[PDB]
Amino acid sequence: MGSSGGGGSGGGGVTADIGTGLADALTAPLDHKDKGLKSLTLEDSISQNGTLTLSAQGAEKTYGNGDSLNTGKLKNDKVSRFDFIRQIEVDGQLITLESGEFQVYKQSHSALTALQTEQEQDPEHSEKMVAKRRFRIGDIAGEHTSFDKLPKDVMATYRGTAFGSDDAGGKLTYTIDFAAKQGHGKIEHLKSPELNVDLAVAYIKPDEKHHAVISGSVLYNQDEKGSYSLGIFGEKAQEVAGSAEVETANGIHHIGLAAKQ
């Protein structure tokens, strides 16, 4: 650790300026070469966020009930995580402001969203203020097909991004096994006291209803004891989204996950 050194910012992967691809979904609308979808209005996508600004790893845009979006660039497995505050105040209707995080993933034919919260306010009198972590999953997955559609020897591996209630979203990649519910990977994203760790996985048949299921336990070589449970949506090659539990030594945290293939 003095004469041999060859690793700049290899602490993880994408940084505050790596895959800005998302920065093109807030300031870069459709275009003249979208081999597929060029955008998606949200005339009803929301309803409780009459207005809410959101900044991505490159740019930001105002969204809310009646707002619109443009992902003509997204691909079969693209992500869309950005910070935004859902505030609704009309001249005679909704009236409040709430900040939180956003998690929108895109598959090949379907997609999956996820809303996160961090601060709120209640204009009832002296309650115009709140604090807590509320993550509400969004858009379903790419395809909810019970892995039973091909339970033989297909190793089901999935990797994507996650989100904790007290940590930076999350980043993880696991390798699961078809019907032989057998998987195991590692979760990592930030550098907190739980930067990364090793986790296990298990592919079940009947997931949330009849798709690919995932279950395992995460643990650090130091003294961490977290868990992991998710459901994949693809014969054995679509996407996977769910959440996990992480217990430290005097508290319990919850991290949601969202990945493709």
Automatic annotation (TrEMBL):
Intracellular or extracellular location(s): Cell outer membrane
GO cellular component: cell outer membrane
Domain Factor H binding protein-like C-terminal: 148-244
Coiled coil residues, start to end: none
Any matching Pfam family: FHBP_N
Gene3D superfamilies on file: 2.40.160.90, 2.60.40.1980
Residue ranges annotated for the Factor H binding protein N-terminal domain, each copy included: 9-80
Record-linked NCBIfam families: factorH_bind
Name this polypeptide is given: Factor H binding protein variant B01_001
